Amino acid sequence: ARDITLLECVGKGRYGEVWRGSWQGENVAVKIFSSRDEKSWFRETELYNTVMLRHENILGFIASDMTSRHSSTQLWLITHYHEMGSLYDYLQLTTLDTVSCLRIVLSIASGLAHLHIEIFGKPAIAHRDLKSKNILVKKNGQCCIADLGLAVMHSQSTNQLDVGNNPRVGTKRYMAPEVLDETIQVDCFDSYKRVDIWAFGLVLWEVARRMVSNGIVEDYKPPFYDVVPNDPSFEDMRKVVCVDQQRPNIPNRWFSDPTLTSLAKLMKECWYQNPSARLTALRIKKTLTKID
Amino acid sequence: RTVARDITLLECVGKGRYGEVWRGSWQGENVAVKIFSSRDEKSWFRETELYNTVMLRHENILGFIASDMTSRHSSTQLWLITHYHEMGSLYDYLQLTTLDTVSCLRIVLSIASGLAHLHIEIFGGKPAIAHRDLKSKNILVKKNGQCCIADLGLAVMHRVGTKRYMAPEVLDETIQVDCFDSYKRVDIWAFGLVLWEVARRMVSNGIVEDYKPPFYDVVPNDPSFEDMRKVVCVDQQRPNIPNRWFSDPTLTSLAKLMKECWYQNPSARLTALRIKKTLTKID
Ligand SMILES: COc1cc(-c2cncc(-c3ccc(C4CCN(C)CC4)cc3)c2C)cc(OC)c1OC
Ligand SMILES: COc1cc(-c2cncc(-c3ccc(C4CCN(C)CC4)cc3)c2C)cc(OC)c1OC
Ligand SMILES: COc1cc(-c2cncc(-c3ccc(C4CCN(C)CC4)cc3)c2C)cc(OC)c1OC
Ligand SMILES: COc1cc(-c2cncc(-c3ccc(C4CCN(C)CC4)cc3)c2C)cc(OC)c1OC
């Protein structure tokens, strides 16, 4: 029973479209890629070929298809469906308590450590576009990481399955200093893990703002909302991150709450300009497991 | 909208180290479904990446329909779906069938047309493509008498090839691997062997040769790399041209053509475009 019914469009952008569909009587998400993003479709298909990729905190794969008649081609990715939508969507109007905030951020750390660590199998994987729109919320209050179209793979028993020649990929708002200044070591797998850690810190900040403490919470804002234009360019981001050495501000009310004090310390250890100074995903996961 | 993806697998028409090929049915229409072995997974990726780069459409190239990857409990299933050619492969067809002048030329000109289309860069278009496993089992026969080239799982854009069809520069490891033209010239060598296989089955003066694969008389049934190197590189043997061909003007011209695909020096061999021109002036 391979047939799918497309029921409603839940997203449209430069990436193509995502549809809620029905398959074997279950909701599925069907992404139809833009022509512009055909290399992402193939990269994501290469990533999902890994059976040991499967994890509670990684978006689960059902099928990938490239179809053509005559001169046009369609590119399909079919996954499990998360009706709560992205973490970006969820944070807009929901506030969090301590338990819900830690559950979300530990689940993302668990997914990211699963990607980064080689299994002897699954290669080590760096995501390269981590952000709150690429994280889905599950009904159990954990998240899963989505969109492996820019991912890079590495095997310690051999070598490295790397990028296109274009290093200006990833979402500009979440790009690490070394991506924005184009000094990143492109032949070094560890470089790409360190870019993910930078972006994880920004996602931690986005989530923590929405956790209530002492009857106070911040409104949802994207990273660097206060220092860059609404739709920031690559150069806008380079200016604030590389020239101005800006990092997201820690609201002072956080320092009255032990959880938010711990999270502020963790996100600062994701934001060093020196990529090798940043925490590992495993260390973040260990730290969040210990925080109450 | 409904996306009908069900494909009914009706009969297995091929089994091998590569996996299986099935005749299937989608929406009342025959398709061919290649189900890849774990052994041959990289061929699915290479062909899929090529068709994602350039959607080839040519009467003498097997017609792409889809690349499918389906998650199973503990495995990934990889299918390539193409048009279906009920007459099967040229290899199959030549075992039983003899040819006349018109059929022989139509077959070999259609293969040369497919191969030149792969080899040529078209601007505005397609990258140049070398096949790297051209042989009579990777050519399908169509009802209109033309053939189409199949299996781009080893193709390169600008697993090893079948040993029996490897050019001398592949067997002696002197191939200039950093030069794309090298891979075109390896295909031309293999094309010459296919042209020999076909020409043997063309009747002249009531005479025809039995189907044999290239080098049948000088290598074992399943030849080693070394077996082939000794024949092709050390002794510099080439397939036999029977005397009876020299009584027939078509087979005389085809013998000259196949000799010009088999030079030891890869840069001396004819190009696919020159082979096409030569064939349009025979008969
Ligand atoms: C994969 O293969 C097959 C696919 C199909 C098929 C089924 N539904 C719809 C389509 C289609 C419609 C419209 C557009 C275009 C039209 C112009 N512009 C607006 C862009 C969009 C593209 C595609 C097709 C091609 C049929 C087939 O056979 C009859 C196929 O072959 C097996
Ligand atoms: C990020 O990337 C991918 C995501 C998905 C995916 C999976 N489940 C659910 C969704 C979703 C559903 C619904 C909403 C709501 C939110 C707000 N409301 C106002 C409108 C709609 C948002 C999101 C998505 C987008 C599938 C993908 O591929 C098939 C993705 O690409 C890899
Ligand atoms: C996913 O998988 C398979 C799909 C199909 C298939 C079945 N029905 C319809 C289609 C179709 C084509 C094109 C469009 C649209 C695209 C955008 N719009 C502006 C124009 C037209 C819609 C739908 C397809 C591609 C067949 C399959 O097997 C033969 C598939 O499995 C490999
Ligand atoms: C070389 O490679 C590929 C080939 C094909 C393919 C396409 N049409 C038809 C065929 C076929 C059909 C029927 C017979 C036999 C069965 C009955 N009788 C005893 C004589 C005839 C043989 C062959 C094939 C094998 C598809 C592929 O992929 C989907 C191939 O791989 C790219």
Cα separation, B184 vs B169, in Å, equals: 12
Cβ distance of A1 and B2 shorter than 8 Å? no
* Minimal-distance CA residue to ligand 3 atom 27: B5
Cβ distance of A48 and B69 shorter than 8 Å? yes
Cα separation, A54 vs A63, in Å, equals: 13
Cβ neighbour number for residue B254 with a 10 Å cutoff: 24
Cα separation, B155 vs B134, in Å, equals: 10
Of B61, B90, B113, give the one whose Cα is nearest residue B278: B113
Residue B145 marked in a binding site: no
Report phi then psi at B8, rounded to 5.
-80, 120
Cβ neighbour number for residue B51 with a 10 Å cutoff: 18
| CB crowding A256-292: b at 16 or more within 10 Å, else e | ebebbebbbebbbebbbeebeebbbbeebbebbeebe
Cα Rg for chain A, rounded, in angstroms? 19
Distance of CA A101 to the CA centre of its chain: 17
Cβ neighbour number for residue A134 with a 10 Å cutoff: 22
What distance in Å separates residue B141's CA from the closest CA in chain A? Answer: 21
Beta-carbon contacts of residue B129 (< 8 Å; ≥ 6 apart): B50, B54, B56, B118, B119, B152, B155, B156, B157, B158
* Minimal-distance CA residue to ligand 3 atom 1: A65
Beta-carbon contacts of residue B234 (< 8 Å; ≥ 6 apart): none
- CA distances from residue B40 to B4, B151, B154, B160, B225 in whole angstroms, order as listed: 28, 12, 10, 11, 20
Is position A3 annotated as part of the catalytic site? no
What distance in Å separates residue B7's CA from the closest CA in chain A? Answer: 8
Cα separation, B260 vs A227, in Å, equals: 70
Instruction: Tell me which DSSP letter residue A177 carries.
Output: H
> Would you kindly state where each structural domain of chain A is located, as residue ranges?
1-83, 84-292
One-letter amino acid identity for A87? L
Beta-carbon contacts of residue A118 (< 8 Å; ≥ 6 apart): A124, A154, A155, A156
